[PDB]
């Protein structure tokens, strides 16, 4: 065959619903954890424990001037 036989070949496709659900779930959890840690580190922060910024940082609660606009209104429409 090597003398004159050629077939293209492709990469192994992962069409499994279990591992696709796991990949999408873990990527969503990791990006939302990274986003919330970045936003809690670069702003005012609260803490459930005394002087606890590295582990479980909370974004501090800011008051709105008009709170029904950020509560009741839909953001994806």
């Amino acid at each position: 065959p090597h003398t004159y036989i050629k077939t293209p070949t492709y990469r192994e496709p992962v069409s499994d619903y279990q591992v696709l659900r796991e990949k999408a779930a873990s990527q969503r959890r990791d990006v939302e954890r990274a986003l919330t840690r970045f936003m809690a580190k670069t702003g005012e922060t609260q803490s459930l424990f005394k002087d606890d910024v590295s582990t479980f940082p909370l974004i501090a609660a800011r008051p709105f001037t008009i709170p029904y606009l950020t509560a009741l209104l839909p953001s994806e429409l």
Partner: protein, 403 residues
């Protein structure tokens, strides 16, 4: 080209509005060369109120000022806000166009919303040119989809590395370096970084380039994400930060020099972690650095970048690339020890190139020479590289004593 008149068949139609049944063709020619003669005398006298009253529009008050000039009675009802509508009537052999006027109840003009009151003429002064070009005051002319969570994360992380404060930047870079799930946002970060390094050509901002290089250095330290599929975008961005010539806004005081050795260390890391024999990353990078260094006409900044990258690649690279062109130091010291021009910027860049060259060639001279090194400096170019090599041997002896 020719004298253009209204058509003679347009006067048979007009003569039947009058009641004239049969009008011969010599009378219709007699009518249309007179009415198209009086149109051209009010077309050209309306243009004298369009030009003397500087308007370039020919409003309908220009024709009414010219009919007043030719003593003919005015045309009533052409100052209202209208346009050109026409309505085609097919018919059983009679083809024509008309207006199709409309009606309106009288109480819906008594109860229309009134327009806003006009303003009076006032004056305004502003500079148009100040001893030269125009100022940039506003009175002058000007010259697959990320989810909302990760869209917000992308927005906050990118706007934290633009330079409002340093602490949010450090937490954003410590987020990029140490999060597990930042894939699906790697192409956006690569596009952001490469386009931002490109935007340096419009605005020579050293600071934003240092911030983008610290963004790349933070992206490399992430254990979870693999930059193999996106390294073809980050390689020329760091290369642009190395071998471009104008990295500064004020060339003399801005330390473009550090964004040089920082990005050189970065590209040595990017071709240590990712160079494979299928990639040929390191050999291509060395070839670009080499043909930028050996080729003359290159500025001292880009030669500094080439020498910095080549010397951060390793010891054998400076053995087989830097050490053949050590005679080039003489061509450098042509423009350093010896003038006549001194107040140019070609001296600070030249002795920066000199200092980097002898700092990196001192351990290479310590590796491939005798231990004595009595007059190696004299044998070296300019006798300075040899003094640096003696200092390097002394430093190595001190390190051995510490060990």
């Amino acid at each position: 080209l020719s004298n253009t008149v209204l058509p003679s068949e347009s006067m048979k139609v007009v003569a039947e509005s009058m009641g004239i049944a049969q009008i011969q063709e010599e009378t219709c020619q007699l009518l249309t060369d007179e009415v198209s003669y009086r149109i051209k005398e009010i077309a050209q006298d309306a243009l004298k109120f369009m030009h003397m009253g500087k308007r370039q529009k020919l409003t309908t008050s220009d024709i009414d000022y010219a009919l007043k000039l030719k003593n003919v009675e005015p045309l009533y009802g052409f100052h209202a806000q209208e346009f050109i509508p026409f309505r085609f009537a097919s018919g059983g052999g009679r083809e024509l166009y008309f207006y199709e006027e409309k009606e309106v109840d009288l109480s819906d003009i008594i109860n229309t919303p009134l327009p806003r009151v006009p303003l009076d003429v006032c004056l305004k002064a502003h500079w148009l040119s100040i001893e030269g070009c125009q100022p940039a005051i506003p009175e002058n002319p000007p010259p697959h989809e990320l989810s909302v969570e990760q869209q917000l994360y992308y927005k906050e992380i990118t706007e934290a590395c633009v330079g409002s404060c340093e602490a949010k930047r450090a937490e954003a870079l410590q987020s990029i370096a140490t999060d597990p799930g930042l894939y699906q946002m790697l192409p956006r970060f690569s596009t952001f970084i490469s386009e931002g390094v490109r935007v340096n050509v419009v605005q020579n901002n050293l600071a934003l380039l240092i911030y983008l290089m610290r963004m790349v250095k933070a992206l490399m330290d992430n254990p979870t994400l693999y930059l193999e599929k996106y390294v073809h975008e980050l390689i020329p961005a760091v290369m642009t930060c190395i071998v471009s010539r104008q990295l500064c806004l004020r060339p003399d005081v801005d330390n473009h020099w550090a964004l040089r050795d920082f990005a050189a260390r970065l590209v040595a890391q990017i071709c240590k972690h990712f160079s494979t024999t299928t990639n040929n990353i390191q050999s291509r990078i060395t070839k670009t650095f080499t043909k930028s260094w050996v080729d003359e006409k290159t500025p001292w900044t880009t030669r500094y970048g080439s020498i910095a990258g080549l010397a951060e690649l390793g010891h054998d690279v400076i053995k087989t690339l830097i050490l053949p062109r050590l005679q080039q130091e003489g061509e450098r010291i042509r423009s350093v020890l010896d003038g006549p021009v001194l107040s140019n910027i070609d001296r600070i860049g030249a002795d920066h190139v000199q200092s980097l060259l002898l700092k990196h060639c001192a351990p290479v001279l310590a590796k491939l020479r005798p231990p004595p090194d009595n007059q190696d400096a004299y044998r070296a170019e300019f006798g300075s590289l040899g003094p640096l090599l003696c200092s390097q041997v002394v430093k190595a002896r001190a390190q051995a004593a510490l060990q």
